[PDB]
Amino acid sequence: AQNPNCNIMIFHPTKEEFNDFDKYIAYMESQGAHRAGLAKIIPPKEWKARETYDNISEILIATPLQQVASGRAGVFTQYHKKKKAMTVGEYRHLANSKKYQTPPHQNFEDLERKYWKNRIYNSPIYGADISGSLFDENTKQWNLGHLGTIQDLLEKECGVVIEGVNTPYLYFGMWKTTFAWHTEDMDLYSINYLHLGEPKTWYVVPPEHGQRLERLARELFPGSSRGCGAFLRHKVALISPTVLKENGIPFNRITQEAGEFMVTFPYGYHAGFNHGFNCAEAINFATPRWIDYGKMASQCSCGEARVTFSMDAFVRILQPERYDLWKRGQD
Ligand SMILES: O=C(O)CNC(=O)C(=O)O
Ligand SMILES: [Mg+2]
Ligand code: NI
Ligand SMILES: [Zn+2]
Numbered sequence: 001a002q003n004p005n006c007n008i009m010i011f012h013p014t015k016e017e018f019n020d021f022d023k024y025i026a027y028m029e030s031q032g033a034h035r036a037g038l039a040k041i042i043p044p045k046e047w048k049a050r051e052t053y054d055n056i057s058e059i060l061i062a063t064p065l066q067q068v069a070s071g072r073a074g075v076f077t078q079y080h081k082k083k084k085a086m087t088v089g090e091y092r093h094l095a096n097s098k099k100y101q102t103p104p105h106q107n108f109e110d111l112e113r114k115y116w117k118n119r120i121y122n123s124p125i126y127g128a129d130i131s132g133s134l135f136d137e138n139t140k141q142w143n144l145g146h147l148g149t150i151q152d153l154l155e156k157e158c159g160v161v162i163e164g165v166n167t168p169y170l171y172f173g174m175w176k177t178t179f180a181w182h183t184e185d186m187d188l189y190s191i192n193y194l195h196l197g198e199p200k201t202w203y204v205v206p207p208e209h210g211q212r213l214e215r216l217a218r219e220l221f222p223g224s225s226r227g228c229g230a231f232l233r234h235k236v237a238l239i240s241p242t243v244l245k246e247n248g249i250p251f252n253r254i255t256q257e258a259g260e261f262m263v264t265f266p267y268g269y270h271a272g273f274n275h276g277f278n279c280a281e282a283i284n285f286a287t288p289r290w291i292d293y294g295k296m297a298s299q300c301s302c303g304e305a306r307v308t309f310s311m312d313a314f315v316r317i318l319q320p321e322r323y324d325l326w327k328r329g330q331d
Contacts, residue, residue, distance in 0.1 A: 003032025006206035008252045015044040018141040025287060036252060037268020038204040041261040050136040053196045057089030061127035067178055069120040074240035075220050076120050078178060083125060088172055091127055095174035095277035102175045102276040108255050112201060115273050116240045119176055127172030134195050134281055144168045144193060144283045153286040160317055164310030168283040173274030180235045181271040185307055186314045187293040188284040190264040198276030200256045207267040209250045216247050233300035238271060266293035294318045301329035
């Protein structure tokens with residue numbers, strides 16, 4: 001069995017290997033990359049996402065989100081307070097202000113220490129989940145707006161044509177902006193490209209151990225667990241690496257830098273934080289290997305998770321017994 005310790009793997013495809021996206025995902029899996037839940041892909045030196053980032057300041061962040069924490073430094077939830085719209089140039093200036101900028105630090109490990117010590121005492125503002133793309137239309141390789149759609153994959157594997165669309169999302173971050181512990185909708189893959197700016201640190205639990213994380217989370221967030229049998233679908237709970245280690249939960253960590261891709265694999269729980277002003281693009285995708293994960297994915301039916309239009313068909317076809325309850329939670 002390849003990668004039996006479930007380490008995060010880093011790949012350096014050549015320009016020739018970068019042509020065929022599906023084939024390269026399958027290659028990475030042949031080497032055991034999925035066992036980690038997360039892989040890094042460093043593009044060939046010949047590749048670029050677009051020519052420059054000099055002309056992005058007028059993009060609008062219609063609903064910036066202030067991430068307010070409650071709890072203790074290593075075990076907390078966050079809620080999202082909506083703020084007034086602002087442009088990317090306005091947001092960048094805000095991120096660089098004395099109130100929000102990255103503190104002085106020695107290296108990524110020192111900054112990680114500072115994040116976990118101090119995150120809860122601040123409320124950073126995240127420009128998350130903005131439909132759009134920064135890939136040039138002429139970029140033919142690993143262009144996150146030109147991937148095969150999940151609806152087409154389901155149709156190819158299962159024969160059933162379904163409604164829905166699959167487009168990318170932009171994320172504008174600042175110091176301490178945080179993504180809570182989660183797997184993707186319907187335990188899909190994700191791919192994330194860090195277009196510009198400061199790094200993003202990731203934590204991940206191997207898919208084969210995801211239920212260990214869920215059991216810890218039920219213990220640590222006991223009111224939330226009573227409220228909902230899949231409350232990590234709410235995307236609000238954080239648990240630090242120190243707490244994970246104290247409770248024997250298997251996990252790994254890695255820092256993504258500008259110009260790098262990360263892939264999350266089906267049922268790979270992940271969480272993390274941004275080092276400073278940055279912009280990422282991400283989208284969900286599927287492969288044949290996903291189908292069995294989609295059929296077994298947990299679902300939130302309490303009302304909190306509320307998701308896209310396109311998840312309806314995935315539940316309806318892959319999980320018909322759960323469909324009626326889940327759709328009630330949507331309405
Ligand atoms: O970058 C973020 O805030 C969160 N991204 C992801 O969870 C992802 O790409 O799957
Ligand atoms: Mg612009
Ligand atoms: Ni994710
Ligand atoms: Zn719920």
